[PDB]
Tab-separated table of C-alpha atoms and ligand atoms in Angstrom:
chain	number	residue	atom	x	y	z
A	1	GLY	CA	-47.501	47.835	11.746
A	2	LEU	CA	-48.618	48.833	8.251
A	3	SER	CA	-52.092	48.447	6.808
A	4	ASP	CA	-52.611	46.112	3.868
A	5	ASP	CA	-52.987	49.205	1.590
A	6	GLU	CA	-49.653	50.335	2.679
A	7	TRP	CA	-48.158	46.928	2.165
A	8	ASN	CA	-49.623	46.928	-1.440
A	9	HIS	CA	-47.678	50.076	-2.076
A	10	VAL	CA	-44.567	48.593	-0.746
A	11	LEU	CA	-44.669	45.234	-2.467
A	12	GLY	CA	-45.807	46.865	-5.767
A	13	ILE	CA	-42.659	48.943	-6.097
A	14	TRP	CA	-40.492	45.975	-4.792
A	15	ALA	CA	-41.730	43.896	-7.745
A	16	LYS	CA	-40.284	46.633	-9.973
A	17	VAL	CA	-37.050	46.417	-8.225
A	18	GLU	CA	-36.378	42.742	-8.431
A	19	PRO	CA	-35.651	42.437	-12.178
A	20	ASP	CA	-32.684	44.840	-11.566
A	21	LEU	CA	-31.878	43.944	-7.924
A	22	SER	CA	-28.179	43.722	-8.296
A	23	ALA	CA	-27.733	47.192	-9.773
A	24	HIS	CA	-30.025	48.519	-7.069
A	25	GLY	CA	-27.856	46.812	-4.392
A	26	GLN	CA	-24.651	48.000	-5.808
A	27	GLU	CA	-25.740	51.634	-5.967
A	28	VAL	CA	-27.058	51.462	-2.310
A	29	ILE	CA	-23.679	50.339	-0.944
A	30	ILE	CA	-21.748	52.827	-2.920
A	31	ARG	CA	-24.042	55.751	-2.008
A	32	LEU	CA	-23.825	54.627	1.693
A	33	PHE	CA	-20.063	54.990	1.657
A	34	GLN	CA	-20.036	58.157	-0.265
A	35	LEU	CA	-22.613	59.995	1.729
A	36	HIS	CA	-21.465	58.462	5.179
A	37	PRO	CA	-17.876	57.522	4.897
A	38	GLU	CA	-17.649	56.338	8.428
A	39	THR	CA	-19.813	53.322	7.590
A	40	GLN	CA	-17.075	51.926	5.349
A	41	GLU	CA	-14.969	51.277	8.298
A	42	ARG	CA	-17.330	48.526	9.583
A	43	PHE	CA	-16.407	46.590	6.481
A	44	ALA	CA	-13.001	44.921	6.822
A	45	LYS	CA	-13.352	43.445	3.288
A	46	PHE	CA	-13.830	46.744	1.591
A	47	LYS	CA	-11.273	48.711	3.737
A	48	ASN	CA	-8.939	49.031	0.704
A	49	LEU	CA	-11.508	50.317	-1.851
A	50	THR	CA	-10.585	54.032	-1.120
A	51	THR	CA	-11.681	55.684	-4.332
A	52	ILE	CA	-15.144	55.825	-5.774
A	53	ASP	CA	-13.960	54.286	-8.987
A	54	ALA	CA	-12.639	51.284	-7.335
A	55	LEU	CA	-15.913	50.799	-5.611
A	56	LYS	CA	-17.722	51.063	-8.878
A	57	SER	CA	-15.509	48.339	-10.117
A	58	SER	CA	-15.641	45.845	-7.379
A	59	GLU	CA	-17.407	42.587	-8.018
A	60	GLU	CA	-17.576	41.948	-4.237
A	61	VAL	CA	-19.403	45.244	-3.576
A	62	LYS	CA	-22.053	44.340	-6.216
A	63	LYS	CA	-22.557	40.788	-4.857
A	64	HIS	CA	-22.646	42.183	-1.241
A	65	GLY	CA	-25.127	44.761	-2.381
A	66	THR	CA	-27.306	41.989	-3.951
A	67	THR	CA	-27.142	39.987	-0.748
A	68	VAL	CA	-28.342	42.927	1.244
A	69	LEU	CA	-31.387	43.630	-0.853
A	70	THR	CA	-32.162	39.950	-1.163
A	71	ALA	CA	-32.447	39.769	2.616
A	72	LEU	CA	-34.463	42.900	2.765
A	73	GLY	CA	-37.008	41.722	0.151
A	74	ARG	CA	-37.671	38.460	2.107
A	75	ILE	CA	-38.366	40.474	5.211
A	76	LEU	CA	-40.645	43.005	3.412
A	77	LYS	CA	-42.548	40.007	1.846
A	78	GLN	CA	-43.524	38.785	5.299
A	79	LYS	CA	-45.258	42.115	5.877
A	80	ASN	CA	-46.018	42.736	9.670
A	81	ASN	CA	-44.964	39.315	10.903
A	82	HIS	CA	-41.399	39.133	9.986
A	83	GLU	CA	-39.855	37.721	13.193
A	84	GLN	CA	-38.296	34.703	11.884
A	85	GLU	CA	-36.535	36.368	9.053
A	86	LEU	CA	-35.378	39.257	11.013
A	87	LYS	CA	-33.916	37.359	14.015
A	88	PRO	CA	-30.793	35.985	12.410
A	89	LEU	CA	-30.057	39.395	10.857
A	90	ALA	CA	-30.408	41.144	14.139
A	91	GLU	CA	-28.146	38.446	15.655
A	92	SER	CA	-25.319	38.906	13.236
A	93	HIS	CA	-25.543	42.654	13.144
A	94	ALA	CA	-25.641	42.857	17.019
A	95	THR	CA	-22.903	40.227	17.858
A	96	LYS	CA	-20.578	40.102	14.869
A	97	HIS	CA	-20.653	43.234	12.882
A	98	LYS	CA	-21.861	45.528	15.709
A	99	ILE	CA	-23.816	48.054	13.773
A	100	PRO	CA	-25.497	50.957	15.544
A	101	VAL	CA	-29.144	51.839	14.770
A	102	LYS	CA	-27.982	55.238	13.394
A	103	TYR	CA	-26.155	53.319	10.601
A	104	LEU	CA	-29.369	51.361	10.006
A	105	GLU	CA	-31.306	54.555	9.448
A	106	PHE	CA	-28.593	55.846	7.086
A	107	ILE	CA	-28.981	52.761	4.772
A	108	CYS	CA	-32.755	53.046	4.935
A	109	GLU	CA	-32.708	56.534	3.666
A	110	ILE	CA	-30.299	55.665	0.924
A	111	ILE	CA	-32.639	52.647	-0.255
A	112	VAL	CA	-35.578	54.978	-0.562
A	113	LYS	CA	-33.427	57.653	-2.424
A	114	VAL	CA	-32.080	54.973	-4.907
A	115	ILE	CA	-35.503	53.607	-5.707
A	116	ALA	CA	-36.945	57.029	-6.116
A	117	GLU	CA	-34.198	57.904	-8.501
A	118	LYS	CA	-34.623	54.712	-10.512
A	119	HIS	CA	-38.422	54.719	-10.603
A	120	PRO	CA	-39.534	58.302	-11.115
A	121	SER	CA	-42.892	57.458	-12.421
A	122	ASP	CA	-44.029	54.698	-10.144
A	123	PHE	CA	-42.617	55.821	-6.860
A	124	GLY	CA	-44.952	58.568	-5.723
A	125	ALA	CA	-45.777	60.222	-2.593
A	126	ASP	CA	-48.000	57.462	-1.207
A	127	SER	CA	-45.461	54.827	-2.044
A	128	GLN	CA	-42.443	56.634	-0.530
A	129	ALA	CA	-44.496	57.218	2.666
A	130	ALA	CA	-45.377	53.544	2.875
A	131	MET	CA	-41.835	52.352	2.145
A	132	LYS	CA	-40.507	54.774	4.759
A	133	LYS	CA	-42.893	53.323	7.318
A	134	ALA	CA	-41.947	49.664	6.362
A	135	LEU	CA	-38.284	50.440	6.812
A	136	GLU	CA	-38.969	52.218	10.086
A	137	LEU	CA	-40.778	49.098	11.316
A	138	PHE	CA	-37.725	47.019	10.213
A	139	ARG	CA	-35.260	49.408	12.106
A	140	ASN	CA	-37.431	49.318	15.226
A	141	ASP	CA	-37.696	45.644	15.377
A	142	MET	CA	-33.972	45.234	14.683
A	143	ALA	CA	-33.300	47.694	17.593
A	144	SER	CA	-35.580	45.563	19.970
A	145	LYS	CA	-33.876	42.433	18.847
A	146	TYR	CA	-30.508	43.767	19.372
A	147	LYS	CA	-31.153	44.047	23.187
A	148	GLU	CA	-31.794	40.333	23.363
A	149	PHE	CA	-28.208	39.829	22.335
A	150	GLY	CA	-26.703	42.272	24.783
A	151	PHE	CA	-26.274	45.028	22.245
A	152	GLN	CA	-27.344	48.633	22.650
A	153	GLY	CA	-27.380	49.888	19.136
B	1	HEM	C1	-30.343	47.883	6.920
B	1	HEM	C2	-30.264	46.982	6.086
B	1	HEM	C3	-29.260	45.785	6.345
B	1	HEM	C4	-29.435	44.554	5.855
B	1	HEM	C5	-30.845	43.912	5.279
B	1	HEM	C6	-28.113	43.900	5.857
B	1	HEM	C7	-27.959	42.565	5.511
B	1	HEM	C8	-26.781	41.862	5.540
B	1	HEM	C9	-26.639	40.472	5.080
B	1	HEM	C10	-27.823	39.614	4.631
B	1	HEM	C11	-25.388	40.199	5.400
B	1	HEM	C12	-24.523	38.884	5.390
B	1	HEM	C13	-24.994	37.747	6.302
B	1	HEM	C14	-24.859	38.262	7.714
B	1	HEM	O1	-23.699	38.520	8.097
B	1	HEM	O2	-25.858	38.407	8.413
B	1	HEM	C15	-24.826	41.383	5.995
B	1	HEM	C16	-23.485	41.507	6.187
B	1	HEM	C17	-22.932	42.596	6.830
B	1	HEM	N1	-23.635	43.680	7.185
B	1	HEM	FE1	-25.375	44.199	6.788
B	1	HEM	N2	-27.177	44.637	6.445
B	1	HEM	C18	-27.879	45.818	6.753
B	1	HEM	C19	-27.289	46.996	7.110
B	1	HEM	C20	-25.965	47.118	7.504
B	1	HEM	C21	-25.270	48.355	7.823
B	1	HEM	C22	-25.952	49.734	7.878
B	1	HEM	C23	-23.975	48.042	7.922
B	1	HEM	C24	-22.754	48.899	8.270
B	1	HEM	C25	-22.875	50.163	8.373
B	1	HEM	C26	-23.840	46.635	7.741
B	1	HEM	C27	-22.624	45.912	7.777
B	1	HEM	C28	-22.550	44.533	7.478
B	1	HEM	C29	-21.286	43.824	7.720
B	1	HEM	C30	-19.950	44.513	8.228
B	1	HEM	C31	-21.458	42.708	7.177
B	1	HEM	C32	-20.364	41.661	6.877
B	1	HEM	C33	-19.931	41.703	5.442
B	1	HEM	C34	-18.757	40.596	5.196
B	1	HEM	O3	-19.003	39.527	5.002
B	1	HEM	O4	-17.644	40.944	5.258
B	1	HEM	N3	-25.116	46.035	7.532
B	1	HEM	N4	-25.664	42.418	6.001
B	2	CYN	C1	-24.839	44.895	4.601
B	2	CYN	N1	-24.260	45.865	4.797
């Protein structure tokens, strides 16, 4: 679990992200695919965006990216007790999309990299440590949840 000081670090940067969420989302999905091309294959709807350019141009990618971060910010806002918001995510990711935990850690690292790039003066060492720990808590709990649905991860 994180301490409240850590949580203050996390939610402080998150407040800086929200006014530009969509552009943050978009860049996370694109960087995901670029740096770990095998993840693209889990997405039937984006199967055909083979070039980088096309990805940059897709309205669907941007809206999917926004959806992703929107879910993530509700979970981070519940701090250590985020059961209820996490459950339905773990359910869809375990039974419908089937995404391994290794792919979850890949996106996590890319979220931290994107924010760091976009907030060079407010995302310092304490904050990146705290955000890394919040996302690690989210991956861990997703991984526990997954077992309740019959999925290994
Ligand atoms: C780690 C942060 C993640 C979050 C917060 C996130 C969140 C979401 C949300 C809110 C949705 C749509 C509603 C739902 O189906 O539950 C979703 C869709 C999906 N997620 Fe994720 N996701 C995460 C990571 C991943 C990863 C790493 C992958 C694949 C490598 C992935 C693949 C998908 C798929 C395939 C869909 C369906 C998209 C469609 O409608 O066609 N998710 N995700
Ligand atoms: C969501 N990927």
